[PDB]
Amino acid sequence: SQYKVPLVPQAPLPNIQAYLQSHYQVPKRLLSAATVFRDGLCVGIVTSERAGVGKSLYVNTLHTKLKAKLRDETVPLKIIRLTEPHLDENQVLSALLPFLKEKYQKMPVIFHIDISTSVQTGIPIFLFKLLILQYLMDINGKIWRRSPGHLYLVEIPQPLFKFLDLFPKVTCRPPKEVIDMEPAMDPVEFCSEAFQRPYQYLKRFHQQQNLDTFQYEKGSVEGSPEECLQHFLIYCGLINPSWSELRNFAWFLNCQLKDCEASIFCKSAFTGDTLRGFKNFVVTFMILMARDFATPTEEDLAPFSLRKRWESEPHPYVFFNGDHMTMTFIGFHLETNNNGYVDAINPSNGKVIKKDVMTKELFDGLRLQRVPFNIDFDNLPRYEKLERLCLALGIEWPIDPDETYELTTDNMLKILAIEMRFRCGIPVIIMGETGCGKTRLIKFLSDLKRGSVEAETMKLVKVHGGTTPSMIYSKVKEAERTAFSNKAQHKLDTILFFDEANTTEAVSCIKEILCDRTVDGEHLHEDSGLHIIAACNPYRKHSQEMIL
Amino acid sequence: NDSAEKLYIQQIVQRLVDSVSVNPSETCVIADVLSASQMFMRKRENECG
Ligand SMILES: Nc1ncnc2c1ncn2[C@@H]1O[C@H](COP(=O)(O)OP(=O)(O)OP(=O)(O)O)[C@@H](O)[C@H]1O
Ligand SMILES: Nc1ncnc2c1ncn2[C@@H]1O[C@H](COP(=O)(O)OP(=O)(O)O)[C@@H](O)[C@H]1O
Numbered sequence: 001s002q003y004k005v006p007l008v009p010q011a012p013l014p015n016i017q018a019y020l021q022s023h024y025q026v027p028k029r030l031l032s033a034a035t036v037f038r039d040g041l042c043v044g045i046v047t048s049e050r051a052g053v054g055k056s057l058y059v060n061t062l063h064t065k066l067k068a069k070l071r072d073e074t075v076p077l078k079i080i081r082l083t084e085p086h087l088d089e090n091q092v093l094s095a096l097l098p099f100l101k102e103k104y105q106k107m108p109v110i111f112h113i114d115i116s117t118s119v120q121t122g123i124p125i126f127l128f129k130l131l132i133l134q135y136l137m138d139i140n141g142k143i144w145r146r147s148p149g150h151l152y153l154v155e156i157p158q159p160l161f162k163f164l165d166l167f168p169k170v171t172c173r174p175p176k177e178v179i180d181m182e183p184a185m186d187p188v189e190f191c192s193e194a195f196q197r198p199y200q201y202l203k204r205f206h207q208q209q210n211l212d213t214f215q216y217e218k219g220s221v222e223g224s225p226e227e228c229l230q231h232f233l234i235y236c237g238l239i240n241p242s243w244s245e246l247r248n249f250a251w252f253l254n255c256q257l258k259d260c261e262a263s264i265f266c267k268s269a270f271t272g273d274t275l276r277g278f279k280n281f282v283v284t285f286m287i288l289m290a291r292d293f294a295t296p297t298e299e300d301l302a303p304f305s306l307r308k309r310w311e312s313e314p315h316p317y318v319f320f321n322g323d324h325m326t327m328t329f330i331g332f333h334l335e336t337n338n339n340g341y342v343d344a345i346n347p348s349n350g351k352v353i354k355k356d357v358m359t360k361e362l363f364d365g366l367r368l369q370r371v372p373f374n375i376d377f378d379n380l381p382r383y384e385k386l387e388r389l390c391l392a393l394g395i396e397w398p399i400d401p402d403e404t405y406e407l408t409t410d411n412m413l414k415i416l417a418i419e420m421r422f423r424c425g426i427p428v429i430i431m432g433e434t435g436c437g438k439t440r441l442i443k444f445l446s447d448l449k450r451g452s453v454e455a456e457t458m459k460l461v462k463v464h465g466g467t468t469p470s471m472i473y474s475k476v477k478e479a480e481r482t483a484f485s486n487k488a489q490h491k492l493d494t495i496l497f498f499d500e501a502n503t504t505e506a507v508s509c510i511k512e513i514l515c516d517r518t519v520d521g522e523h524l525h526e527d528s529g530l531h532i533i534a535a536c537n538p539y540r541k542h543s544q545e546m547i548l
Numbered sequence: 549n550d551s552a553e554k555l556y557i558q559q560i561v562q563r564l565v566d567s568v569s570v571n572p573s574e575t576c577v578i579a580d581v582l583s584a585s586q587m588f589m590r591k592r593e594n595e596c597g
């Protein structure tokens with residue numbers, strides 16, 4: 001204490017930032033990975049206030065920018081998912097050890113450190129060790145050196161607000177926050193059909209035109225990223241979306257409009273010449289349908305415990321049969337309105353939502369065409385409702401897998417919602433208590449899907465209080481192997497199930513499995529055939545008398 | 549919502565007692581006393597877990 005300096009030296013923030021930015025400059029004629037970054041900076045940190053905004057897609061676009069320049073690229077993209085609290089340097093050290101000790105990978109390689117949200121007390125020491133001090137050291141082992149010529153990118157979600165401003169930082173924002181001050185599309189996604197075809201129909205739906213003229217000329221129509229963003233923001237319902245929901249909406253609309261185009265209903269309207277006005281009701285009901293699916297919304301349990309909606313809420317479900325050429329209607333009823341139209345209601349009460357949808361000549365056409373409209377599933381037998389399901393799910397020649405499972409209307413709304421959620425591309429996560437039947441529900445779905453084959457389809461993965469991540473990647477990898485085997489030999493798709501998948505610190509790795517389709521940095525195969533379904537316990541406090 | 553709870557408890561007791569010769573009628577007694585215990589659990593300010 002007697003050798004104390006009562007001065008506390010300090011420097012301004014722009015001086016430190018200019019110092020680090022000037023000493024991170026990779027020079028010319030070095031053939032580095034930094035030539036695609038901000039004029040050779042070689043270290044970046046991408047952050048945001050909220051998640052789902054496009055950090056990893058920015059990293060991927062920088063990676064493909066480095067693919068484009070410097071031909072015969074063959075560049076690796078090393079991904080190290082840091083996922084545990086009380087952060088360990090030996091994990092990222094052992095992940096980086098077998099990489100740059102071969103001296104044929106001294107070609108420029110983009111490195112991409114991914115720091116998750118559950119790493120509470122180990123961040124600035126690791127950041128200052130890697131980015132400033134340029135070393136990772138083991139006490140009994142080797143020493144890593146950060147090299148001027150390998151580009152590094154360290155994610156962080158948002159104390160740290162003061163600390164993360166030192167490094168050369170590139171920030172990213174939701175589409176609401178880049179439409180007022182600044183394109184915003186990923187240009188390879190706008191050229192993709194999944195964002196083109198729903199735009200191709202919503203462009204003609206916004207200002208009123210008849211959809212009797214055929215679309216999808218397989219090329220991009222003359223549009224802009226900003227006006228497409230304007231359409232997808234005004235047609236989503238929620239007022240502050242991330243980039244996840246807006247992409248979810250677009251893939252959902254792609255899947256339902258592909259199911260509409262796969263039917264002969266447009267061909268029947270062409271050959272009958274009095275069926276039109278149908279597709280306006282189609283796209284309007286799919287806006288309602290997508291508002292039903294992908295639009296949600298104690299002071300520290302407020303983002304968790306506050307459930308905005310439950311199953312005690314009307315979910316009007318519509319589905320298009322693939323092989324067979326009719327439709328179905330589950331969850332809502334149609335009754336005559338006094339203004340000359342037909343409104344939609346939910347059973348057991350009176351609700352007058354979604355007025356003024358469509359006209360009478362379409363009802364004349366579908367009454368002529370004999371579609372199953374306005375049927376209440378309280379008084380149907382077992383074979384009729386299983387036939388309705390096998391028409392709905394596309395299953396041919398149904399065999400009843402279990403008559404002990406009593407199928408109520410909630411137990412078929414959940415079936416339909418779950419199967420289309422893993423059909424179109426949304427991640428499937430279940431918020432439910434212990435007493436609710438989810439394992440039996442997904443077992444019934446898997447047994448109905450496999451029908452009569454004795455192969456293993458449903459694989460339960462139990463997630464307990466001491467589940468390390470390594471067994472989770474091992475189980476997901478062996479689920480991939482049995483998925484390839486099952487689709488190779490039986491043409492059958494499997495279901496991977498995570499039950500009480502909320503207790504571990506590896507819930508970020510659980511998010512890594514299905515939300516982005518990448519395991520341990522390796523991309524999951526979209527053509528493999530695999531559906532990951534996870535379940536979490538709800539967040540609520542005990543009673544105060546219980547604590548007493 | 550406990551409308552189907554008496555259905556679920558009766559299905560479990562008829563599936564897991566294996567009552568091929570126990571009683572044709574007392575399985576309803578077992579099912580609704582289990583449902584009465586479940587309703588007494590629900591008609592209380594808290595549960596255990
Ligand atoms: N600017 C953008 N334009 C188009 N799509 C975008 C954009 N930004 C993100 N996306 C989409 O967002 C989805 C997921 O986003 P991404 O994985 O990049 O989020 P993130 O910021 O890494 O999330 P997290 O913090 O949760 O890990 C992808 O389907 C991607 O196409
Ligand atoms: N349709 C159904 N018919 C009969 N019982 C059901 C049905 N759905 C769920 N159950 C009941 O749910 C219980 C499952 O308990 P639990 O293990 O807590 O389920 P989960 O593993 O889904 O949380 C079983 O006793 C089963 O009888």
Ligand SMILES: [Mg+2]
Binds near residue numbers: 055116
């Ligand atoms: Mg991330």
